[PDB]
Amino acid sequence: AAKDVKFGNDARVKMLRGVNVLADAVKVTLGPKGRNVVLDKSFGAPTITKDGVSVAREIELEDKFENMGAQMVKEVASKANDAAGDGTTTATVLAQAIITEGLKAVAAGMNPMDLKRGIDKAVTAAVEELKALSVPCSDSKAIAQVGTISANSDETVGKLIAEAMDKVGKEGVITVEDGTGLQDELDVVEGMQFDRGYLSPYFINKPETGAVELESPFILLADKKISNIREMLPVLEAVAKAGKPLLIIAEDVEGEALATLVVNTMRGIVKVAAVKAPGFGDRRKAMLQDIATLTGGTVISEEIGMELEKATLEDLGQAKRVVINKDTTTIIDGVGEEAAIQGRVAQIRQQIEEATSDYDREKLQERVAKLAGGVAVIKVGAATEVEMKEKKARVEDALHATRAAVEEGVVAGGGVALIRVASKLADLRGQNEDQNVGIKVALRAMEAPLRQIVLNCGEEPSVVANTVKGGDGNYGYNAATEEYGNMIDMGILDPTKVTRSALQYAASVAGLMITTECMVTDLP
Amino acid sequence: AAKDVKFGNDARVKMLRGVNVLADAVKVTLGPKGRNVVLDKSFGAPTITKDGVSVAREIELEDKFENMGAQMVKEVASKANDAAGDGTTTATVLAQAIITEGLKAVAAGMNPMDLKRGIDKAVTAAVEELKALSVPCSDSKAIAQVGTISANSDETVGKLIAEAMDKVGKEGVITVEDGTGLQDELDVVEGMQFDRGYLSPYFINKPETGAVELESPFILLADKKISNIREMLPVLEAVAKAGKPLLIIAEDVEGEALATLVVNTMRGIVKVAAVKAPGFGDRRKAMLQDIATLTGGTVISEEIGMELEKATLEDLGQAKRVVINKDTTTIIDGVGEEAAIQGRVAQIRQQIEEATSDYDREKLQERVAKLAGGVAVIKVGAATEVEMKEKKARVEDALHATRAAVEEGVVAGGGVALIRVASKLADLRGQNEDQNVGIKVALRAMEAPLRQIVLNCGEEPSVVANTVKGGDGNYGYNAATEEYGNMIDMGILDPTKVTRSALQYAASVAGLMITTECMVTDLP
Amino acid sequence: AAKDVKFGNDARVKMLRGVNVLADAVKVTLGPKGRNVVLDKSFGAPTITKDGVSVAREIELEDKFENMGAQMVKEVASKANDAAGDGTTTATVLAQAIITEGLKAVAAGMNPMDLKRGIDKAVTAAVEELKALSVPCSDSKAIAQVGTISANSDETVGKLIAEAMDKVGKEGVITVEDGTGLQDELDVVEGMQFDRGYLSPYFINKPETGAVELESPFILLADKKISNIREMLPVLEAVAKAGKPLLIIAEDVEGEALATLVVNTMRGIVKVAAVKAPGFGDRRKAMLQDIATLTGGTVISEEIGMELEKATLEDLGQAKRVVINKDTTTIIDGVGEEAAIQGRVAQIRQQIEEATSDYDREKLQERVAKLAGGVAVIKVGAATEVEMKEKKARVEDALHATRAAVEEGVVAGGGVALIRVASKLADLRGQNEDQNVGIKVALRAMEAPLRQIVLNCGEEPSVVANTVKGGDGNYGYNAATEEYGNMIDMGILDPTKVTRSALQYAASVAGLMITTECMVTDLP
Ligand SMILES: Nc1ncnc2c1ncn2[C@H]1O[C@H](COP(=O)(O)OP(=O)(O)O)[C@@H](O)[C@H]1O
Ligand SMILES: Nc1ncnc2c1ncn2[C@H]1O[C@H](COP(=O)(O)OP(=O)(O)O)[C@@H](O)[C@H]1O
Ligand SMILES: Nc1ncnc2c1ncn2[C@H]1O[C@H](COP(=O)(O)OP(=O)(O)O)[C@@H](O)[C@H]1O
Ligand SMILES: [Mg+2]
Ligand SMILES: [Mg+2]
Ligand SMILES: [Mg+2]
């Protein structure tokens, strides 16, 4: 492939122009007054979104040299999204400013690497000052406020997420799904629920409910595929004599069991119901042990050393009450020893802290929530699918912000936290004059989010920036009410993790970009 | 893919131009005087239709930026069609007006999101006022009038649908099909009819009829595939002694049965006929239970715990009289206990209210109609297929409008309902001046359907709008007779659900569209 | 696909231009003096035809907007062909006139839908007046005259079809095939003939004839595949003792039978021949029952309850005399009970009147003709294949016209019937002035066929139209002799069904076309 090369300022000019095209589209979204971008999906209706990471992945430029600049700043937004749902737009705005100021310094002949070292020195110091500025958030009032700000000032979204925050507990997982009702509704599942349904419609003992309710059940957690009632019988006889209902969890079941079960249940000899084991593989096995510990029961298994037919009635688990639908299994309140259950939750927590796949760790979190916490799903409600998608993105970002707020605390919102940290690090000096110039580039860039929110509002950014810089503590401009007040008091709060992540990601990519002296790309 | 980006007014201009191209084609159809659009089907003759949703899906523009605007307003018409058959054109006209007025306000510098909040505040209030304005419709005179208006003023269509409305009852389902006779004919099926036919032509006991009529039959509702008369015999012997005819419903049947049955029937030993079970799968099983409850009989099944050959004569169902053709099975008046049948209809109604697939819910409605209501099919009649298609769309829309009218009542038609609700919500004020401007945009847009119907008539829209706005109650312009009168008295009625749905869908998509500040699309 | 849209007059102009291109090609053919169109078949020689439906399917225009108009008027000719073979050109001429007059009225600002209602009101009234004008045709003199006019004034074609009309009877079916002899010849098959031939050349008992003639045969109509003489023997022994010849009709036959049959027949022990059962499937079974009823015999079948070998000599059918060739089977005059045969013909007639597939109904008509009527084939004769094709189309149209004439009577030909009906409906008035204008458009269009026939002759259309309109009854212009006289007396007769069908089809498509206000089609 023939390669066209460009050098020095000419290369840096096209690279900056590409950064400007990406930054401009993301910049319009920044702020409560920020508008939305209609990204075009060719196979379908265009999508209207205020999410910066969404816009970033979409843009690429036909000028190859400009595209290289755009692709490199796409990274800061993408990693910010990986860290936390919010901060993707603010990271891009900070990165754009560091690149613009840095390129001007490189043009003055300042050594690019020395400026990079200076920028990094300032960022490391700033992150520490953000931790000092941070004050912890766990008040549900504060949790709602971080959610509301994260949802483009939607009070209802923050209010609902705080309640779901409340009900699930810390181990709990909150999820969002499309709900066709135009109002949002929150449902919190109680106890261990697996998404599997009764094998036979005949099993239903409550037809109006359409569900099988077994009060006081014993529970068999079985290994393997079991289509021999033929072999399982003496266990079954003992249960029939005992007279408590039974649940069978198992992997593969014929009519050999189900018709025999209908013969027994529907004519009132025995009281039984049966469900398919969740998911597949060794993940189903690991899960079955969690159920066994909860139910005061056993994973009853040939491959772990029991003939299944040898099982005694004490070898099974027990619990209060179960309800099963065609999609749903719920289990109320286990016989299992509380310290054993807490031990398994902690033993799982060791797996959670060691977990090398975050997505696998989420599944572990779902297992933590079934075992001790709760699962909450928020039904995002909108008249049209256009509205549903933008609504869900705002609710998802609120979910991520609330989690970040609890973990590492909260800082003043609207960019006043970055302004205050920059003022406190003004005397920070690097080893050489280029490092000193680099430190200044980072501090000036930190004022950029406040300026852009004010620009979107339409007020003069510099005049407002001067008033906020002149002010102290959390004094800041409320963009929505166009007034100056304490941000914490006015409810404008940003999670510390998202602000710290935005600075670190922007500085790393921007610092490398200023050092570029040659660009090599395919000839047009 | 190289992406070309546009910003601010330039982006909004092309987006509005795309909305205008779609809106203009749908607008011509609005009103009784509205003409028809010849959409071109490349594989076949072009289609002449007055249906807005049909036109909307068809249009796309080669200008990529304009196409994005057109695709987004296609949604309001498409969702309106999903909600109810009618309202697809009115929703587009309302949406076009809100976008045009909103874009002008955004040009004045009004904050786009604040206008969106104001528009939403007005719409929520307007929907409540439409419910107050709504008066219930169930008079067959009124049901015919909503059908007639929904069929471009076809009196015969409304008249026929009211009768079919009458005969089926509320649980009943009405369907439309092409009928080659040039006059429309309605046929109402009575009782449970499944579309399956006699397995053997030899079964016919009434050759001139070409159908098997069994008077006083017993009915076997069988499980599984049964090609062993070989095994079924002792049941069959008991019936032969009893001397009432029998029907066999079953899944798979050889000549092992049919020739033996011909040997018995055609030489007068026994009196029998046999049909194939309807559809396939577990849906056939769920259906067979409904037949069993109706016939005072049983789903006789190995897999639900009976050897089939053990069945007694009391274990079967019974009914008055059956008739079977090569396509058709009809069953007259069952032995089943009325409260058991009503219970199963209610138990099914629980499934209906829980039903997550609407299309599956329709099949449940067909099962409700076979069990307690009726099924009516309207044979749309036209000289040519060009005429048949436009005729059927008008009859289909009338079917949807009549159902909507019964459920949520009726409002004045011709746009006077939207004009009256807008007048009653004039003092509604939002939190800030942009929200106040947003409320006004929605109220002005509500006058748009009346204006467009008058424009299609050719009378001056503003002069008529002023007279209707000056008037009160249901006073409105009868477009067909070019006169002003009470709409309810003149028979111009619109279902409340369709008017409310049009406003809500238009407001949601339009409100998002005004907020757009940047558009990203593939380079031409 | 990018869509280019056009509106109002601009759209109507291109649509009319497309109608004009199609209409012009079909118009030249109208009239006895009308010339022929050389449609080009790319894979082969071009085809010279005077048939309008043939020309219509061929034409399409490269201008997309013009093509949409052409495709829509293709429908009126195509449906006219489906109704009856003739009337395809006259329907196009009537449709073109209604569209031209209607578009001019829409240009004057007349409401398009109101004109459509007026046109429809006039057409409904005109169809009733055509029924009053109609006088029944069944005289073979009149039947020949409708055939002659339908064959571009070919006296021989009408004369031959009247004789074939005569011989077959009403239940009879007449067919046309290419005959290489340059003179047309008619052959009428007598009685039941199926197109199957002797299985063995050795069966021939009359070698000079090349056919097997069995005088006084018994007939076995067998079920299934039978290659066991091995099993069939005791029946065969009884026949050999009886000494009347036998025919075997059956599905699949080895040399196991045929060599054994040659051993018996060719050495004079037994007298037998054997043929393959016609077609395939259950249609062959339904047909075999018709043969059984005719022959005073039985479908002898295991699957309908007889072991085949149990059959007695009375269980078979009998008839006068059979002749079989390698292609042909003929059966002369059955033993079957006449009221049973008439009953089966009537029982079949119930199937005929119920018949949902017209093409399947034709096969039922062939079965009606074999059972009670006759089958006649006309061998179209021409020197070249170019001539054969045009000759056959003219003979086919004559066949369709003669059938239409007998069913719904005859009206004056040359367009004078449409002129007279239009004069009688002049005072018909619609509800509003646009409906009145619509009625006038239809009446003026009805004069169009007469004008176009006169234009093709070369005489002034308006001068002749005035003389015919001034005249009364059947007074009309004989185009061939360029004279004015009573049409019935001069032999110019048109079937009422074809004239009524042409008006109805033209009005429906034309009425929709005038209402078009926007056209949407793919960008060139
Ligand atoms: N009234 C407000 N005052 C100032 N800024 C606000 C206000 N409300 C929300 N914000 C937000 O403005 C910034 C939010 O950025 P945003 O546009 O939501 O995308 P992202 O969080 O991904 O960067 C944050 O500084 C946050 O404070
Ligand atoms: N004579 C009439 N007066 C005013 N409007 C009428 C009259 N008859 C029917 N309409 C209709 O005009 C509008 C019907 O819109 P329409 O063109 O049928 O498509 P859609 O219902 O999908 O919006 C409704 O306001 C309805 O009232
Ligand atoms: N001598 C005649 N006088 C007037 N018209 C004639 C004469 N002979 C045949 N015609 C025919 O002219 C019209 C025949 O139309 P034709 O060209 O055969 O195609 P099509 O029947 O499909 O419309 C009919 O009105 C018929 O009467
Ligand atoms: Mg954010
Ligand atoms: Mg409508
Ligand atoms: Mg003709």
From Swiss-Prot, chains A, B, C:
Q: What is the effect of changing residue 397 to A?
A: Can bind ATP with normal affinity, but is defective in ATPase activity. Binds non-native rhodanese, but cannot release the protein
Disulfide-bonded cysteines: none
So what does mutating residue 108 to C actually do? Forms inter-ring disulfide bonds. Prevents ring separation and leads to the formation of high amounts of symmetric GroEL:GroES2 complexes
Which residues does the annotation say bind ATP? 29-32, 50, 86-90, 414, 478-480, 494
Q: Which UniProt keywords apply?
A: Acetylation, ATP-binding, Chaperone, Cytoplasm, Isomerase, Nucleotide-binding
Q: What's the impact of mutating residue 75 to S?
A: Complex stability is significantly decreased.tuberculosis
Pfam families referenced in this protein's UniProt entry, alphabetically? Cpn60_TCP1
The reply to whether Ribonucleoprotein figures as a keyword in the UniProt entry is: no
Q: Where found, per UniProt? A: Cytoplasm
N6-acetyllysine PTM sites in chain numbering = 116
Q: What is known of its domains?
A: Each subunit is composed of an apical domain that binds non-folded proteins and GroES, an intermediate domain and an equatorial domain that binds ATP and is involved in inter-ring interactions. Forms a large central channel that appears to traverse the entire length of the cylinder with no obstruction. The central channel of GroEL functions as two cavities, one in each ring, that are separated from each other by the crystallographically disordered 23-amino-acid C-terminal segments of the seven subunits. The entry and exit of polypeptide seem to be restricted to the apical end of each ring. Modulating the volume of the GroEL central cavity affects folding speed in accordance with confinement theory. Small proteins fold more rapidly as the size of the cage is gradually reduced to a point where restriction in space slows folding dramatically. For larger proteins, either expanding or reducing cage volume decelerate folding. A stepwise reduction in cage size results in a gradual loss of cell viability.
Q: Which family does the UniProt entry place this protein in?
A: Belongs to the chaperonin (HSP60) family.
Q: What does this protein do?
A: Together with its co-chaperonin GroES, plays an essential role in assisting protein folding. The GroEL-GroES system forms a nano-cage that allows encapsulation of the non-native substrate proteins and provides a physical environment optimized to promote and accelerate protein folding, probably by preventing aggregation and by entropically destabilizing folding intermediates. Also plays a role in coupling between replication of the F plasmid and cell division of the cell.
Can you name this protein? Chaperonin GroEL
The scientific name of the source species is Escherichia coli (strain K12)
**What broad taxonomic lineage does this protein's source fall under?**
Bacteria, Pseudomonadati, Pseudomonadota, Gammaproteobacteria, Enterobacterales
